[PDB]
Design a protein around this nucleic acid. Structure first.
Ligand SMILES: [Mg+2]
Ligand SMILES: [Mg+2]
Lengths: 143, 255, 51, 34, 151, 41, 267, 213, 226
RNA sequence: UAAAUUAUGGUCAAUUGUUAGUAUUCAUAUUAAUUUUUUUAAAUGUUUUAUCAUUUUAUAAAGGUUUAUUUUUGAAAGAUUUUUUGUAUAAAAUUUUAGGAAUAGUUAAUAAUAAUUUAUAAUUUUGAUUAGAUUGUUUUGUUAAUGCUAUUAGAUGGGUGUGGAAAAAUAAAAAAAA
């Protein structure tokens, strides 16, 4: 039951067969897992993860090695930084000076709409050819 | 130049300050990401909130799912302890003994003056509520923190028999704290989250072992798989393990 | 001919505001909180000294 | 049908329109039409 | 298209030149593809490789191909095209026969082992073109015999 | 070109007279290409 | 391949046509493939390739083809040195959006290549025109890196050789001097330019203020070779040769719903 | 004013109350991370992004946002001006002044603020680094500042940073820490752009809390 | 007076009695396309513009319009257009994300029928619950990244098979064996041995130089004679 | 699986070209528009003030964008006064070319990190990215009509970043502190 092709699979048509066959949603969810923490509160708007953390549950899928390594590396960040800043303030202060002057010496230090645009090349395309040269493609993501 | 001029992660506005003093009067400078780190990342699990009156007196007894020493979780945590000791030798006092592992389902404080009549009712209620439930199977994986990192426990993800376990523990709370007056740390209408404590900092050990367990100790094992364990017994026990070298036996039901 | 005689006589028999049905307009919880706070502030006071 | 749109002959315009036909729209059953 | 040509229009510089991929060490993801004008699945089967049978890896062809014929007729085709067969080529043929030996049952592989020994007899009587029956080929044949249980 | 230019419901694939004008073009194209191929060879 | 296209004279003529009317990529790829498969490349082929490489002003391709010539053991003439020094001088460079157009120039070190090419062209017995020296000085001084001592030595050599000075290299050297804070050298350059009569610096003459003392992202501009906007220049002068400051735009040379002819107006 | 005292009294009586089975964890929800508007706005621990019409039970705050006010000599084009910066730390309920100092020096994230040893003081009174916030009665509304080692003589021009407007900066001075960040040489792009205000921005006199006209 | 004839127009300053005063934009203009490129040398490499191309986003013919009457709007009372979307999660390779394929609907009045167009979205999820195959519901929220403005609200269908495969350690879904074509020209499998690698390279380079020679154009009928 | 009626109700759908064996909407009509008989400029000094200054005066055409243009009440309206309450940069859908293939300071996590972190990254044959064309979702013309055929003016990078908001370098049918 390997997916036929990546082009069709990306658009979510491989799993669309279950939808088309009438077996779209039939699993008896309560038996396989607790359904109390698999939904979201409409009144508050908090997501399923928020509901799970409020109820003390954790619906975490089995993880490969790379994601666990990423999680550990991101978790160790504050512990490393707290001791590094105390032990070796020289390099930390040098980096802080560099960032402090970099914020002055940059592009659009003011947080206007132009700088606030999350996707600058996609939003401003008419100046992407003759005014700017930094970007070569007008879009880089799905949107 | 590396990415967006104003990253989304840095567009933080603080509403704890007065509205008109941040623009001109002063500028607040702090790292706001640490407090917004999610409970999933930081390992915090929302434990049942205890009322102030019940949060003062220390607990006396607790329900647990008694397990044989051969069970898979015991040797998984044994290997975890071996790795922790090999990496750092200073966390041994924080780490608990492998033979003192139980799956807690509830904690309560029975006064010693009138304990004799209450324990009989508790054990008969446990027997009458477990005369029908078949032995449970629970898959243990993940790490969590209680009491602001004071207690380190193995998470219990939802799985088969977990719904039956939570229904049974709700029924137990109703039949123990509801009809007869016993000080449950949580609420009778609330459900206690099962867990097995792998590490814990005692209040007497708080003097020299810091204020919380650093996350780097269990960061690599935060999502480790400890496997599936079958439980077929329940025990109401007391915090006395040193004399007999094992869990104190106060009440037992062979589920 | 756009005259009134072209329009139906039944247009004149209806009561006031009976043409409008019931609407179910729901918003985000954040928008609900914002609107509730704004309306509460307006009820408490709508202008400096002309309220 | 404007003569400048697509080719000089009208069948050019009709073939150009046929690529936007809802019944023949690109999907799993009909893909890589061009 | 940035490396070759600026915008296009100049003939011969629109489509990327022919790309050759090693299936054992693929330099692309999802080598096979489905497109109206880029159907390459049919160009990765037996029959297209007869043009370059004088210089190819028979072991790799056995490892990854489509509608591959029987090993006996494959050897017959090689002999009829008069391509010299080195030691690794003979070993590849013998292991291609052994991977059918293994698929066949333990008690039902006698006929296939007889086919293998007939193939070895033909190989040793090949004469021209020069067929290199080497130590690796003998090892592959002994492995096939061990799989068949004919000690 | 369109060899089968016969009218609607024509009981034959094409027209004999119409087919000759296409056969002549095909023959001329093939002949000139073959002659050029031979010259460049 | 048929013998008509296999004939190397056809290879030479098609390579020359490709160099006359295509981009650098076409010529470089075709020449490299031809050298790989038969088609013994000669000094004429190498000069034709270097023509397009210099026209497009690229340094990595020029050093690659120079290494290829060294491997093939072909003795070049002065045209090769002229082409390589002109390509070095015409190499693109620009500070756009706090981002340099070419980050490879610092690693390539095209200034040393230009200097050694000029020295070899002089030493081997070939003529040395003003353009090669001006291009070498342009390579020495650009907004990218500061190399003013060697540029001053080259300018002294030009002064004693009575060679002409180009306004582009004069402007680049002046900007480099004022950026390195050498107003004395900037004043000397201004005096030299005013005396010569360069179009840009005909009027600009200043008195000497250092009369009693003896000797001892920044820039935001974009520079590309002529070929990039030659079509724009040609059409601008064809349309309006009587109003040079007109900003030739759309609909001036093509009606609505019709191509303007030039693909990639204003890059 | 009234809010703090009434909240304290309510918390006191809530603690004193003994007939309470405890709040329902499922019934009491937490704050959500997803909401409308493209701004991540943090509120108090008792405020929610969603509309919560019911007043929840009071809780003891385990994380006080201590806000420490540092002096900062920003460089305006007219001259050096001394202004105020706020560093916010999240300290536990029983954090000693030693760990408070550790938190402020680890979360200052400014090159100039933590240049030398300093002592925390409130309304001009120094804080003993041995006792915790419980002894001082420090709440989230307490105003805490810091006094450095050399802020008692900042009135001297030698201690004050030397601007190029009035003071001469030497070749050895341009290699120092702040004067390297500042650039006396006007670059073509002018990389170190700073806040500028006119000399007559405040009139003939400087900024003051009283009237001098 | 649009309803009046050309000769009946006594004046054009105002509408005397009533109606619609509309500008008479001249549609019959006879726009002309000017051919500025050779037939086989159009600068673009994929799409060729050889005639007047119709311009418009919604005014083009045949008419195409959004259709807010679909499954998502039938199920949900969306506060904003497209606030909530139901789709299958396809692709879980970025941490704390879940790529969902949700299909909207476009209506063609001319044919009086609708078709569904599939669009992909990046949905943020915590605790990594979204596994390949889950039928999820997502909603709009605050901007999270450059291309993340949706978040999962509930997992309607859990992918039990994917979760069990992950527990066993295998991937949630086997990778497809067919992907995007890297180039238009077919990709031929290379099977040459080490000795024949150089010969195969020579053949490939000869083919490439022949393709480059194709740039020259048609070969002349008369061979070049000097 | 029954008829209707206490009788036209709830307000107008209507097609016109004298051909030429037959097949197929294709020469000549009508309406709308362009075209000849000469219809048809976009004005030059804005103003006040505490004087070598300060205060008031914010979207015209220039640059070619089809997964795209989105934001404030800090000025003003604005009021006994002080004081106070709130925001907002994000989205979703519709997106052109006769002969159709790869695109890129790049995705996500982390943070007021990383020109040098971690990761099996992201875009695209459900037609992407460059290129050509055209100022985007209330405008017309034709017809009885699901169609076909039109429409406009204006958001083209920063670089001491003034201002509430850059829209800030000639261009009025805007009365601008008596
Ligand atoms: Mg025409
Ligand atoms: Mg364009």
């Amino acid at each position: 039951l390997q997916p036929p092709n990546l082009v069709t699979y990306r658009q979510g048509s491989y799993w669309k067969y279950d939808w088309n066959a009438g077996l779209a949603i039939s699993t008896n969810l309560a038996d396989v897992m607790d359904p109390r923490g698999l939904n979201g509160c409409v009144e508050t708007g908090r997501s399923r993860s928020e509901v799970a953390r409020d109820l003390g549950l954790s619906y975490t899928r089995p993880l490969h090695e790379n994601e666990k390594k990423q999680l550990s590396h991101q978790a160790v960040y504050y512990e490393r930084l707290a001791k590094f800043k105390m032990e070796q303030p020289e390099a930390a202060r040098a980096m802080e000076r560099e960032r402090f002057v970099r914020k002055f010496s940059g592009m659009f230090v003011k947080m206007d709409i132009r700088s606030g645009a999350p996707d600058f090349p996609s939003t401003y395309r008419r100046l992407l050819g003759t005014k700017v040269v930094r970007w070569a493609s007008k879009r880089h993501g799905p949107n | 130049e590396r990415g967006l001029y104003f990253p989304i992660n840095h567009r933080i506005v603080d509403h704890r300050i007065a509205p008109g003093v941040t623009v001109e009067e002063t500028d607040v400078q702090s790292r706001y990401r640490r407090e917004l780190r999610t409970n999933f990342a930081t390992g915090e699990t929302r434990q049942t909130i205890a009322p102030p009156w019940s949060a003062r007196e220390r607990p006396t007894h607790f329900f647990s799912l008694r397990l044989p020493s051969r069970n898979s979780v015991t040797l998984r945590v044994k290997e975890m302890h071996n790795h922790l000791l090999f990496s750092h030798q200073q966390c041994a006092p924080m780490l608990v003994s492998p033979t003192k592992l139980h799956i807690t389902l509830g904690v309560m404080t029975i006064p010693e003056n009138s304990r004799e009549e209450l324990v009989k009712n508790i054990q008969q209620s446990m027997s009458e509520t477990f005369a029908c439930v078949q032995p449970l199977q629970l898959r243990f994986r993940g790490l969590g923190t209680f009491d602001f990192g004071r207690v380190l426990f193995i998470r219990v993800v939802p799985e088969a028999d977990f719904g039956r376990l939570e229904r049974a523990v709700c029924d137990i709370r109703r039949r123990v704290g509801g009809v007869l007056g016993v000080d449950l740390k949580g609420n009778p209408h609330d459900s206690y989250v099962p867990h097995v404590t792998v590490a814990k900092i005692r209040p007497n050990q708080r003097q020299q072992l810091g204020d919380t367990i650093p996350q780097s100790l269990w960061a690599d094992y935060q999502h480790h798989d400890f496997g599936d364990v079958t439980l077929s017994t329940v025990d109401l026990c007391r915090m006395k393990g040193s004399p007999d070298g094992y869990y104190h036996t106060e009440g037992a039901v062979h589920l | 001919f756009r005259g009134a005689d072209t329009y139906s006589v039944k247009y004149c028999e209806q009561g006031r505001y009976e043409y409008q049905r019931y609407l179910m307009i729901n918003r985000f919880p954040s928008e609900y909180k914002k609107h509730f706070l704004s309306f509460l502030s307006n009820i408490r006071m709508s202008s400096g000294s002309a309220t | 049908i404007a003569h400048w749109y697509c080719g000089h002959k009208f069948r050019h315009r009709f073939m150009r329109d046929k690529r936007f036909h809802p019944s023949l729209q690109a999907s799993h059953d009909a893909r890589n039409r061009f | 298209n940035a490396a070759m040509g600026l915008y296009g229009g100049e003939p011969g510089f629109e489509k990327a030149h022919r790309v050759w991929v090693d299936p054992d060490r693929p330099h692309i993801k999802h080598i096979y593809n489905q497109t109206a004008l880029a159907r390459n699945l049919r160009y990765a089967r037996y029959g297209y490789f007869k043009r370059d049978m004088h210089l190819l890896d028979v072991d790799k062809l056995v490892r990854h191909a489509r509608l591959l014929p029987t090993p006996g007729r494959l050897l017959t085709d090689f002999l009829y095209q008069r391509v010299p067969l080195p030691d690794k080529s003979c070993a590849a043929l013998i292991r291609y026969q052994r991977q059918q030996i293994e698929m066949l049952e333990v008690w039902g592989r006698h006929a296939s082992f007889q086919c293998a020994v007939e193939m070895f007899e033909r190989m040793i009587v090949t004469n021209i073109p020069p067929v290199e029956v080497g130590v690796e080929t003998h090892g592959e044949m002994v492995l096939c015999a061990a799989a068949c249980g004919k000690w | 070109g369109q060899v089968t230019f016969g009218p609607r419901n024509y009981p034959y694939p094409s027209s004999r007279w119409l087919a000759r004008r296409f056969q002549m073009k095909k023959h001329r194209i093939i002949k000139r290409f073959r002659f050029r191929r031979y010259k460049l060879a | 391949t048929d013998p008509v296209r296999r004939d190397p004279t056809e290879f030479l003529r098609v390579l020359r046509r490709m160099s006359r009317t295509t981009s650098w990529q076409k010529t470089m790829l075709f020449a490299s493939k031809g050298r790989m498969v038969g088609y013994r490349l000669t000094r004429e082929h190498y000069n034709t390739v270097l023509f397009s490489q210099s026209l497009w002003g690229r340094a990595l391709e020029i050093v690659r083809v120079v290494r290829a010539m060294q491997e093939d053991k072909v003795q070049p003439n002065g045209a090769t040195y002229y082409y390589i020094v002109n390509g070095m001088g015409n190499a693109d460079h620009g500070w756009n959006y706090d981002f340099r157009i070419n980050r490879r120039l610092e690693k390539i070190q095209h200034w040393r290549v230009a200097l050694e090419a000029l020295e070899a062209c002089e030493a081997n017995g070939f003529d040395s025109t003003d353009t090669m020296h001006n291009s070498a000085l342009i390579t020495l001084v650009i907004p990218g890196f500061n190399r003013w001592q060697q540029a001053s030595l080259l300018l002294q050599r030009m002064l004693r050789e009575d060679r002409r000075m180009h306004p582009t290299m004069v402007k680049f050297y002046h900007d480099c001097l004022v950026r390195n804070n050498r107003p004395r050298e900037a004043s000397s350059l201004m005096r030299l330019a005013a005396e010569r009569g360069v179009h840009g610096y005909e009027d600009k003459w200043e008195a000497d203020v250092y009369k009693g003392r003896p000797l001892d992202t920044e820039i935001n501009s974009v520079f590309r070779p002529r070929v990039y906007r030659q079509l724009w220049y040609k059409w601008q002068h064809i349309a309006n040769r009587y109003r040079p400051t007109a900003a030739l735009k759309r609909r001036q040379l093509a009606p609505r719903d019709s191509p303007t002819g030039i693909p990639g107006f204003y890059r | 004013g009234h809010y703090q005292q009434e909240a304290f009294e309510a918390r006191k009586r809530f603690e004193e109350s003994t007939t309470y089975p405890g709040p329902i964890r499922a019934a009491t929800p937490g704050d959500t991370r997803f909401y409308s508007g493209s701004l991540e706005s943090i509120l108090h621990d008792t405020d929610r992004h969603y509309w919560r019409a019911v007043t929840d039970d009071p809780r003891v705050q385990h994380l006080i946002p201590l806000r420490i006010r540092f002096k900062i000599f920003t460089w305006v084009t007219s001259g050096w001006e001394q202004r105020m910066q706020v560093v916010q730390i999240m300290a536990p309920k029983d954090s000693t002044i030693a760990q408070v100092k550790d938190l402020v020096i680890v979360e200052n994230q400014s090159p100039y603020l933590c240049v030398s040893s300093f002592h925390l003081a409130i309304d001009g009174k120094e804080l003993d680094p041995q006792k915790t916030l419980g002894e001082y009665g420090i709440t989230e509304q307490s105003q805490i500042d810091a006094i450095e080692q050399n802020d008692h003589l900042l009135h001297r021009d030698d201690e004050r940073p030397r601007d190029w407007t009035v003071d001469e900066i030497t070749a050895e001075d341009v290699k120092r820490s702040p004067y390297k960040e500042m650039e006396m040489q006007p670059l073509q792009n002018l990389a170190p752009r700073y806040e500028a205000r006119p000399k007559g921005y405040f009139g003939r006199t400087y900024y003051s809390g009283m009237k001098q006209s | 007076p649009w309803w009046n004839f050309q000769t009946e127009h006594r004046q054009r300053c105002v509408l005397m009695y009533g109606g619609a005063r509309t500008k008479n934009t001249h549609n019959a203009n006879h726009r002309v396309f000017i051919k500025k490129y050779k037939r086989n040398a159009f600068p673009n490499r994929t799409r060729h513009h050889w005639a007047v191309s119709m311009t418009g986003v919604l005014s083009q013919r045949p008419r195409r319009m959004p259709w807010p009457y679909d499954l998502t709007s039938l199920i949900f009372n969306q506060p904003r257009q497209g606030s909530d979307k139901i789709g299958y999660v396809v692709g879980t390779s970025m941490l704390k994300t879940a790529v969902v394929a949700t299909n909207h609907m476009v209506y063609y009045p001319k044919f009086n029928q609708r078709v569904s167009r599939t669009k992909r979205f990046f949905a943020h999820d915590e605790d990594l619950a979204c596994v390949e195959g889950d039928l999820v519901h997502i909603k709009q929220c605050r901007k999270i990244s450059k291309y993340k403005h949706y978040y999962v609200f509930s997992i309607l269908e859990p992918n039990v098979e994917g979760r069990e495969r992950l527990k066993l350690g295998l991937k949630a879904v086997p990778p497809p064996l067919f992907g995007y074509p890297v180039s238009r020209r077919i990709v031929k499998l290379n099977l040459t041995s080490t000795e024949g690698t150089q010969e195969k390279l020579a053949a490939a380079i000869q083919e490439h130089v022949q393709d480059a020679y194709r740039f020259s154009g048609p070969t002349p009928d008369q061979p070049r004679n000097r």
